[PDB]
Amino acid sequence: NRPNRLIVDEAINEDNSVVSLSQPKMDELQLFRGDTVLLKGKKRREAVCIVLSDDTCSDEKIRMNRVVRNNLRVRLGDVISIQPCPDVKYGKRIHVLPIDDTVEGITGNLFEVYLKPYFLEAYRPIRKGDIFLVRGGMRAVEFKVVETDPSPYCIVAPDTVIHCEGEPIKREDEEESLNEVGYDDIGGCRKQLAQIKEMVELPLRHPALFKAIGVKPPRGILLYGPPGTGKTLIARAVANETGAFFFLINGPEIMSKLAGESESNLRKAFEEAEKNAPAIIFIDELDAIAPKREKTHGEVERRIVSQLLTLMDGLKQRAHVIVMAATNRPNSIDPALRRFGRFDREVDIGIPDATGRLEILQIHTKNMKLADDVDLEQVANETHGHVGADLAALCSEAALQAIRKKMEDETIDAEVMNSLAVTMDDFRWALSQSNPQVTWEDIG
Amino acid sequence: NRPNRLIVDEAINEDNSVVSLSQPKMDELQLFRGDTVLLKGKKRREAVCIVLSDDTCSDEKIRMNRVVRNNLRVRLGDVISIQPCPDVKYGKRIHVLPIDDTVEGITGNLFEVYLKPYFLEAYRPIRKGDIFLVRGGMRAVEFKVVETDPSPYCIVAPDTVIHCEGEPIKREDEEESLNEVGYDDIGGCRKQLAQIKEMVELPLRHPALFKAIGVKPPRGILLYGPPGTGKTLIARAVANETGAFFFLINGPEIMSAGESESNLRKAFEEAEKNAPAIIFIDELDAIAPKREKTHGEVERRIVSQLLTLMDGLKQRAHVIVMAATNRPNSIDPALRRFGRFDREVDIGIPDATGRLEILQIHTKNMKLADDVDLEQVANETHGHVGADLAALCSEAALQAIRKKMLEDETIDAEVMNSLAVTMDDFRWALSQSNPQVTWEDIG
Amino acid sequence: PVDREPVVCHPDLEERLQAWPAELPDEFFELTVDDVRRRLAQLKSERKRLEEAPLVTKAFREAQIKEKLERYPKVALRVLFPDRYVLQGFFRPSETVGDLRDFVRSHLGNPELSFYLFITPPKTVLDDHTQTLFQANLFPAALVHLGAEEPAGVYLEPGLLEHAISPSAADVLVARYMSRA
Amino acid sequence: VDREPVVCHPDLEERLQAWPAELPDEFFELTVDDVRRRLAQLKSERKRLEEAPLVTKAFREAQIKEKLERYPKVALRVLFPDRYVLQGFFRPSETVGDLRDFVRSHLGNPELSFYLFITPPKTVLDDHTQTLFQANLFPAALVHLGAEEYLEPGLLEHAISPSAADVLVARYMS
Ligand SMILES: Nc1ncnc2c1ncn2[C@@H]1O[C@H](COP(=O)(O)OP(=O)(O)O)[C@@H](O)[C@H]1O
Ligand SMILES: Nc1ncnc2c1ncn2[C@@H]1O[C@H](COP(=O)(O)OP(=O)(O)O)[C@@H](O)[C@H]1O
Ligand SMILES: [Mg+2]
Ligand SMILES: [Mg+2]
Q1: Of B115, B148, B146, B141, nearest in space to B129 by CA
Q2: Which of A66, A439, B415, C20 is most buried, taking the most CB atoms under 10 A from its CB?
Q3: What is the 3-state secondary structure (H, E, C) of A308-364?
Q4: Which residues of B touch D119 (CB under 8 A)?
Q5: How far, in Å, CA of A140 to CA of A129, rounded?
Q6: C-beta of residue D141 within 8 angstroms of C-beta of residue D85
């Protein structure tokens, strides 16, 4: 029954042009490792990719990363169509331009720095309209294929003339920034991402089909751990990967508002969320709004708490809204909020272990050129106790150090910026200052 | 300093005849890997061992297993002298006999089952008086070297005639039983063992020297976790390995007015009587549970005695107190504050690696068929604790026995030795896990 | 030992007259209750796996290798030339990159000239001639590119180019062979 | 490399050098220095097991390289059932197969079947393609020999004392 009908899954392989199938699925479609494939989603936008096998796929799965998902306008869980495409002719010439909000601060030869090494004997299949991403010079640049010859698809071969003169282009409305947070931006949280996806993915992604299965969705999820372990990261990534709307409430910020104004902002948040459903409301620092208090005689339940409980109890499944809250410890919070139907699910987003830190360091160095003496495992071993934010800062600091060792303005030449190698000494520097500037440089 | 002075450390190699040294130490002593060495502790009882290199120990360390430590009558941390022993003659003849309490219920040809394969072209160095361990037939038999020719040590060579007729010999009081619990009996607690050693090894082992370095000893230690994770086992091993006397107090038993505080006081008095000692209170919560409210309520007479006995132990007494409980919150907070049980260690549910290690410990004495995949068993036992795993292995062994039957108070060694435990026996045990015959003591 | 059964094909030999595959209906792309049940099931068992953190056992690793070598005793390789000509050959999984290079060398116009073999994307040169096709993941059917330091456009033996076949005829040759014939 | 083959036998030993090595009681006495050193290691092992660091690729590669530079030469001893020892110098990258060839070329009867093993417990060296570094027969290692039912007779007549063989090794290892 429909062998060519596949279900979108997340990539292990992080190359733009690559998708993965199970071998039995490749047998069935008579594909070779390395073959070009033509793919379509519901919106019926096409993509051309190279197919590899994967040992960890279910037969109906197609593993693809965010570049290909965006090009196809699909999300994890969606249906795609696969057909062979050996027709693809070699390109005479192509026209690619950077997207504006990705090249702010840089000048010079984008061909030499990004495009030349990217296409170099890679024989990459491309499609008119594709957005693709190239990493380099402390930055991830996004390029759009404006035109190809032949059209609409070709293989960028050694003879293919690559044209990239012209102004940077405007990002289109449905074209999602690859700068937006997704699952590939989260390290050391495999277990917890799996726990959260199991709870919220289907309710948010397919509300009607979910109801038909009959199991009750969570209403509130409590994420806990120390500051900077990636709680906001996770909730934001889930919102993006599911297509759900994201409304952030800052605890202390809403409490700073005058008596009366707090409660109304709280209501507006929920209304806004219900309005743009499916949605995630994220309450950062929940303990600022509803702390656990000691039993005092004649203590009246804080207006704000009463209001939050009313909103929680009032969210029917058909509202398609899930509430997430961040705290340091579950016991820091009013027990009324933790009773069934409210925040009855909790997920420990704790301090990462050595493997976790390695993954986090690799995420935050992925746009940097690292010298061969850079040993991230060693850096991970030396950062016991560091959380995600500490490690992201550490990487910014190592990079700032490399820049100080070389070069001030609001503009940098691409070739200069690209010549920067962050060394192990730069990390050792950042390590010695670690305790848990220029406009053209955007640091994670 | 003096290159022949080494410090006894725990072994990675389980073999009776093997000690390990760092490669720089072997370079210094001009030792070939596989070469014979001669060892002495302070009691001057010597041992002859084969030496191998180990990549993890520091230069002054000698890694040796418990069999070797008992033979040298040393403990972890003691000093040994090492000298090359190139002059070891091949035995003309030797005499070895089983220790009585290890061979109960066994009859028949001990030579063919245990001794012949153990020595067969193994060229083992042995010393008169040596006790050594041969595993087989779901059992660990201990043997003593009664005589050697030439004396007092030789290599057991192919030409060496091995005599072993005679009566099973009595254990000596100075001779520590290898059936006593040690570190090598514990799996999946490598972290917690280290945490406990750091706290208690030195104060228990060298009281005089410990107080000299200024640091204060731990007063009381709280081991917590669900039942059967090895809290008793750990405390026992620490006592045995440090030479400390061990006193078990069973909380529930003591709680079942009057005679309770008599037992408590005497337990403490007996401990300092035999110092250095560990006092182990199993299920502390049974004695001092967390009380609710009780404002003008008098402290229980039992809880009071315990605080008196505990506060009445100065560093001078050489006693450390250990308690088992499930959750530290089930205990009265008076005990959990400084000067009492101010230190705590989590002996929690083992992971997959942990489980495999426990399974390896409790299958040591079984012959396993080639199809037995203990990793698979570890993978299929998520949630299991040490005690569950020990029971599982026991069920697998019995299943093998069931499949073969024989009945009596006695079994032939060769019969018992032909028992292979197969994967199907573990599948049975697995299906029956839900957390008889006198000639067989199962783990 | 292994019949290489060498063939050459070129994309310019496809027919280009037959109809396109039928367009898919809108329902194809529509997710069902069954799809959602399967996804949930996958999420559930991935969560479990990560909580339990089982061992990847030796027995499992060995059985996985053993099953793959039994399931795919024969390997189809395709070497793609700069001019778009493809050379196709049959190999064993236990044979090597070196064997592949020899095969390519056997069919070159100038057997003396220097070439490298790689997979893409990204460009990954096959520099270890001792690596087996299984180890290199050139298995059970894999596509390899050819490059030369001085791209002098001869490459393949011109007598073979006379007998070049269509890509889809080459595919049939592979299907027949893989069903053990 | 040239093996510099030498044969020794314990019945050719000529020295009873320095025996009364009577060792004082305080040699075995533990000092404050000893106790502190033990505590350090315990603390060190507690920290490592708590922090559970990675064993890194760079560390693993550094150890291999550091040992192969520290010990470029290997001395092997093959001990025969008649207590004769055959000694030969080797390189760590050389194989168990080479060792067997060394032995064979010095046997009285080269067509005779033999096996090499380490002990205890008895472990036969079956993988002839395994290097001496991989076999852990390195930097100086004792190997035994057995047969199903031996050294060239001319070679036995030039046999030296074990202690003389030892000094040859020390001098070769520098
Ligand atoms: N697990 C992680 N993986 C990758 N980056 C992380 C992680 N945790 C934190 N970071 C980095 O530091 C920031 C952490 O902030 P945040 O997500 O607000 O943590 P929390 O919500 O726990 O305070 C993120 O924006 C990200 O850049
Ligand atoms: N970590 C472990 N390694 C090996 N065996 C264990 C372990 N934990 C428990 N066992 C087995 O379970 C038995 C009972 O354990 P015990 O020490 O009484 O546990 P607890 O005191 O935590 O209830 C032990 O005698 C031992 O056979
Ligand atoms: Mg925060
Ligand atoms: Mg218990």
Answers
A1: B146
A2: A66
A3: HHHHHHCCCHHHCEEEEEEECCHHHECHHHHCCCCCCEEEECCCCCHHHHHHHHHHH
A4: 34, 50, 121-124
A5: 19
A6: no
Contact flag A81-C30 (C-beta cutoff 8 Å): no
- Helix and strand numbers, DSSP H then E, in chain B: 15, 21
Measured CA to CA, the distance from residue B169 to residue B179 in angstroms comes to 16
Is there a contact between B120 and D122 (Cβ–Cβ < 8 Å)? yes
Do residue C43 and residue A201 have CB atoms under 8 angstroms apart?
A: yes
C12 close to A (CB below 8 A): no
Is B230 within any annotated ligand binding site?
Answer: yes
Q: Quick one: which atom of ligand 2 is closest to the CA of B188? A: 1
DSSP symbol at B325: E
What residue's CA is closest to ligand 2, atom 7?
B386
Residues 9-68 of B with CB under 8 A from D: 15-18, 23, 26-27, 30-35, 40-42, 50, 53, 55, 58, 60
DSSP letter assigned to residue A163: E
Phi (first) and psi of residue B124, to 5 degrees? -80, 130
| One-letter identity of residue B18 | V
Centroid of chain to Cα B127: 23
Q: From CA D46, how far away is CA C158, in angstroms rounded?
A: 71
* Structure-token pair, residue D89: 């110098």
Answer whether B115's CB lies under 8 Å from B164's CB. yes
Residues of B in contact with C59 (CB under 8 A): 373, 375-376
Measured distance CA(B276)–CA(B208) in Å, rounded: 11
Cβ-based neighbour number of residue D153 at 10 Å? 7
Confirm if B175 and B102 have CB atoms less than 8 A apart. no
Tell me whether residues D53 and A358 touch, CB distance under 8 A: no
- Spatial distance between the Cα atoms of C91 and C99, rounded to a whole number of angstroms: 9
Q: Is D49 within 8 Å of chain A by CB? A: no
> Experimental method used, please?
X-ray
CA distances from C11 to A90, B15, B245, C119, C173 (A): 11, 67, 86, 20, 16
| Structure tokens given for C181 | 């014939």
D143: which chain B residues are within 8 Å (Cβ-Cβ)?
34
- Can you tell me the distance from the alpha carbon of C80 to that of B197, in angstroms, rounded to the nearest whole number? 64
Other CB atoms within a 10 A radius of the CB of residue B415 amount to 14
How far is residue D102's CA from residue C52's CA, in Å, rounded to a whole number?
Answer: 52
Residue in A168, A140, A107, A142 with CA at minimum distance from that of residue A414: A107
C-alpha B201, offset from chain centre: 15
**CB pair distance less than 8 Å for A120 and C123:** yes
Cα separation of B102 and A212, whole Å?
A: 66
The dihedral region occupied by A336, where left means phi > 0, alpha psi between -120 and 50, and beta the remainder, is alpha
Residue A395 is inside which H or E element, if any?
Answer: helix A388-406
* 3+ Cβ–Cβ pairs closer than 8 Å linking A and C: yes
Coil/strand/helix, residue A279: strand
| Angstrom resolution of this structure | 2.5
**Residue B381, annotated ligand binder?**
no
How many CB atoms sit inside 10 A of residue D123's CB?
11
Tokens of D141: 């290692």
- Where is A81: in which H helix or E strand? strand A79-84
Q: Which domains, ranges and CATH numbers included, belong to chain B?
A: 1-87 (2.40.40.20), 88-175 (3.10.330.10), 176-349 (3.40.50.300), 350-443 (1.10.8.60)
Q: Give dist(CA D134, CA D132) in Å, integer.
A: 5
Our CA-based measurement puts residue D54 at a distance from the nearest CA of chain A, in whole angstroms, of: 6
Task: Give the strand order in the sheet containing A220-224.
Answer: A245-250, A279-284, A321-327, A220-224, A345-348
B9, B365, B390: which is closest to B230 by C-alpha?
B390
Closest-CA distance, B189 to chain D, in angstroms, reads 10
